Amino acid sequence: MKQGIHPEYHQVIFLDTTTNFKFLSGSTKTPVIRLDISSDSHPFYTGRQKGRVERFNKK
Amino acid sequence: LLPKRVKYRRQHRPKTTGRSKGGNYVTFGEFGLQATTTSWITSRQIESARIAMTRYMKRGGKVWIKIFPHTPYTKKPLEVRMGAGKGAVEGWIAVVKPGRILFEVAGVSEEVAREALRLASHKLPVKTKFVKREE
Amino acid sequence: RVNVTLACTECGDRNYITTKNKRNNPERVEMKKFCSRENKQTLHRET
Amino acid sequence: DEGRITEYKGNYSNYVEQKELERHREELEYEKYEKEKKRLEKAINIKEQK
Amino acid sequence: ISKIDKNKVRLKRHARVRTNLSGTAEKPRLNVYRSNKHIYAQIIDDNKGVTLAQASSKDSDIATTATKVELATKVGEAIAKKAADKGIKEIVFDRGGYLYHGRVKALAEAARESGLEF
Amino acid sequence: TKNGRDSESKRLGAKRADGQFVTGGSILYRQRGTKIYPGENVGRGGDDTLFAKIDGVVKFERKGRDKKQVSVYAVA
Amino acid sequence: KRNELPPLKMDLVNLESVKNRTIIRGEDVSGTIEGRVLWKAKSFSIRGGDKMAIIGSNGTGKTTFIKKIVHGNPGISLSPSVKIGYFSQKIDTLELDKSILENVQSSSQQNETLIRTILARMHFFRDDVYKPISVLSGGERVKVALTKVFLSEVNTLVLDQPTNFLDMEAIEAFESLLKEYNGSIIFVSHDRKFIEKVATRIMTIDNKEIKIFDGTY
Amino acid sequence: NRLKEKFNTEVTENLMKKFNYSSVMEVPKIDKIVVNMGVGDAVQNSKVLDNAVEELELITGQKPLVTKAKKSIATFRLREGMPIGAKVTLRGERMYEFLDKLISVSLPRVRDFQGVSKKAFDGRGNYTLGVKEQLIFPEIDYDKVSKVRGMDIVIVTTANTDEEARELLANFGMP
RNA sequence: CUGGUGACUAUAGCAAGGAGGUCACACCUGUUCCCAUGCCGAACACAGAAGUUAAGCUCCUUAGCGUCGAUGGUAGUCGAACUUACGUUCCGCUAGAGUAGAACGUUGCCAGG
RNA sequence: CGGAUUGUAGUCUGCAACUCGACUACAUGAAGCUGGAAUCGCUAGUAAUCGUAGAUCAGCAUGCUACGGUGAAUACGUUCC
RNA sequence: CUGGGGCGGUCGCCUCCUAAAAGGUAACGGAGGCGCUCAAAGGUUCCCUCAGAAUGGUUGGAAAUCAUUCAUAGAGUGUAAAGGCAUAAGGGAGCUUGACUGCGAGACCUACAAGUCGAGCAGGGUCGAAAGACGGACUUAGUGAUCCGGUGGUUCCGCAUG
RNA sequence: UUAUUGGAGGUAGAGCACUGUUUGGACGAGGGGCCCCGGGUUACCGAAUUCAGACAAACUCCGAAUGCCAAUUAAUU
RNA sequence: GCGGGGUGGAGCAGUCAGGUAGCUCGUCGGGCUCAUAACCCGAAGGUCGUAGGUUCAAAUCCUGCCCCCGCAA
């Protein structure tokens, strides 16, 4: 790791407050951080998943 | 019959002494034609001979030409004093030395093969004989 | 690309000829070369 | 022009005039040369045919 | 991935060095071999394949707990003492196909300083 | 025609045979590239000539099946 | 023949002109530095397609008027459509920036072949666009400034003393380009005979006061 | 060093129980992550280069290497020396930081995530992502600019079988 | 026997299978100072030895690829004698390909056991 | 600004609104910054503009026919078309 | 010059083949290049090893760039061809100017004039820790006699003496 | 001059190991004309691979006889 | 075989010296007109024969190929 070419890159703590998936890593944000969709909030990794015929039979 | 492309169109004209470097043992077919003498053989002669055999035989028949005229040859323009370079091309030749197999034929009986290759022998500058395979 | 005469910056003696691009090395080119009078390796510019 | 320093007695109008005549003279001499060369080449070709 | 043999790239380099330098009895070459633990060292004429001296960081009174570069320096001192007797004043250093920065450099400086002046 | 030229020949090849006595600086084998490499007491010139550096005796030699060399060894 | 160079031909890459009712407006711009009334507080307005001109003797304040246009809004009223291209009375380029190419491409987003082709129309050849900008002659510095300010994404041009070091056979190309420019231009120049083709809203500064009329005479 | 520790204990345990290795040193690891941007629009305009060069830096926390042509082609007007953008190499804790900052964060930011491919191994146990929407990393700030460019990621491993690659990646968290 | 390092035309190699390790060598733990990578301690280099024979390394077997390779015979050929024939006859050398076969290295110096 | 186009959901008529009615609500929001060569109408409650009504008609009008509200500019004058 | 002369072509140099396994060898025999280039594409010290195919992958021949495996040379070697180079003569990086001065045993080629190679000595040095390399470039073409005149220097003469 | 030894060199031959040429097959790599997104074809097969047979002054994995250059050798001249 | 050429539908510039393809007539739509022509307003129409390289950039320079014109043969 040279000096003069790398930007600042320090430790940071991500958080998916939609489930408080609270996680540690390093990044270049500049140490309290947000996340919006993650493994424990995404339909695949969490498993969950949210017709003209039906619509016509409604009426 | 020609090559599609060659590096040197003006070659030396080949050697005629000696005997076959190969092409002596009949390989593909059952019968063949074998040169007893040396000469050159051209596109024209080959087309003629092959036509002769393929007409004498019905659609039942299979032929393998075994030579190809790689080597070109030159001739100068007419009515020209000697020298001044080397002439253009007018043909393509395969050299033939005694031993070599010119044509091979498969899909027939020996009598039919004899007559076809007989008809062809008269369209080459070479004395030939009729060959069968070996042991 | 042209002929070039060098010359020593403390006597004035040419002592060398060479060649250079007048495009790529346009400036009054200078290099250290032996000078036979001072008997020392001396800086020689172009003239 | 291209390092060649041409000198001209008079006024900028005289420069314009002199350079005009020189351009014109030069073009004419060039046309003369081309025409003559063309002619002689044609002669060459005919004479070679014969 | 296939991993790479440092020994082999080293030896491929060693050959390119040995193309130039060969040695002789008048001045033999200082063979150097390195390992992740410690160094071996020889001094050899190659007109006959006759190693004229040797020392190692393995089997000696030199062996101590510091595998620090100082142990290389002491290998240098050891071949210096063991070779200056045998009439060897000057030699051709063998980089070994290694690089002249660390343990190699330390051994070389030791040998220089111990009378075995190149 | 568009041809009819060739250059002077340069007299390549061996100039002192094997088992032969040779003085210093003596050309042995003029060439182009290392058709033959040097050996002992032999130098390779800029134009790849091979010249002895010491008086001695010439011996062309092997260097691994596609590579020859040449050595000028002293005599007594 | 003489290897005669091809003529000067300047370009403006495109103005998708919109010609709307007004481009600039300002009111009562107090013209001073300190202790000096350079000109009176006055208004002004510039409209779609105006070949505005300025005529003034020395030490008047034309340059400062243009600086007020280009920076600050004291008594000024600009819009987000106008994107000024400022050609200075000074250099405005980077002297030892290692190429005309770089110093130009800094402010424009176009292809290398188009930009070197424009430079070639300006007679900066293949091996000449890497010349430094300090080395250059005055007229060609001026040309490179103009090219940078053209290929800038702009619609109104603001030109303090163009035509200054340029030659008699590029000033004519410039004359014609400004005559034919679909958009707005504002500029200074002391050449009334250059202005004869160009101007449509002539200005005149004098005696610490201002006047502005339309058309030539 | 959560993920290093995770790998060393838990995944190693699982995987060697699964494949029945004769020793831990048979176990596959990751030697490197390699990013690429691969853009030939710099023949047109070189601003493109410096842009993506800066974004690669922002992502991986380290400056990128500029790749360069080696041969010339007339279709793309690509020539020896003209750069085609950049790559990056990553190994160490940077490797795991980047892994997590994909899996936990940005791969859930996919618009339409139907798992991810089971086929994209070369045949030695080494994987590629052909990524489309380069702004699923936060620090781009895609207001300023909209050319996402896509991107290529290449995970490289010391596994022999694509099977072992799949299972180790599963224990990481990748479908 | 291991390791280092030279020598010999790969008969030495490639390939497959199998085997061993704290005394070597290895992988291996980290960037702590020297030092270093158009970016990364991957490499280079260094402080190291918790850990593992998986790999590299070395050893055993196999003749599938490569390499080497007779005898005999042949093409060719210096020379000679006949003749002009796309040649023959006598002598001497002598291929190339192939066939059988060889071979899965051998030594020399030094430190260890 | 303008309100085309398209999507969804609805209302009325009707024997039934795909081709093929009008209308509404929501969503979207195109072209267009006052038009080249040419050219039309109009001399006063006119032109200009804003609404309204009616026949045909189940339903469908930017059209046709008719009504009022506000309300000009100019006509030198016959040289030219 | 020339398979009469003439036209056409050529005239000097470099590399292949003809050229008959030393060398040399002709023709209006066959194929191609030269009249330069490079202050690094030189010198030196360190390090690196290619092209191409299969596979995986965004803007897709996945030919741009990337990752792996295969691959001993088919790449590259400023530029013709040949001979050579992967123990690098090829590709990068750091420092420099030996692309130096005076010479030169002995050799090649050779009618002559010229051309080529050249250890080694001395001087004064760049690089390398040192050994040691270095009097241009992987080699072979990339040139032009004398007279004449121009420019610079000089422990050289200078029509009695200066 | 011969005998012996050694050596440089790539010819005749032979061979296809590269350079180019070439026959007949087995697959094909995917295109193309034509039919209805995909799928067909009594077809080119650009190619790749492979089996067998063949060509070369400017191809050579190989390689003679002769001729040549010498030798601290012997003989005849 | 040798020598010149191939740029919207026709004829010509531009190639020498590389830098955004131009001129006249024509074609198409619309105008004027009783209708047509002329005339006025707009617009299309050019991988510069083709295929390869060099170049940041090719009508332009280099290569190769297919035609066209003369000569010859």
Ligand SMILES: Nc1ncnc2c1ncn2[C@@H]1O[C@H](COP(=O)(O)OP(=O)(O)OP(=O)(O)O)[C@@H](O)[C@H]1O
């Ligand atoms: N920093 C300053 N301090 C004092 N006076 C100044 C300063 N800057 C400008 N001025 C004066 O303000 C006036 C600005 O003149 P400006 O350059 O605007 O005129 P102009 O119309 O361009 O004339 P020209 O260029 O022909 O001289 C001049 O009087 C100048 O001397």
Ligand SMILES: [K+]
């Ligand atoms: K006959």
Ligand SMILES: [Mg+2]
């Ligand atoms: Mg040289």
Ligand SMILES: [Mg+2]
């Ligand atoms: Mg004649």
Ligand SMILES: [Mg+2]
């Ligand atoms: Mg005659």
Ligand SMILES: [Mg+2]
């Ligand atoms: Mg010879």
Ligand SMILES: [Mg+2]
């Ligand atoms: Mg006197």
Ligand SMILES: [Mg+2]
């Ligand atoms: Mg032969």
Ligand SMILES: [Mg+2]
């Ligand atoms: Mg031959």
Ligand SMILES: [Zn+2]
């Ligand atoms: Zn001096």
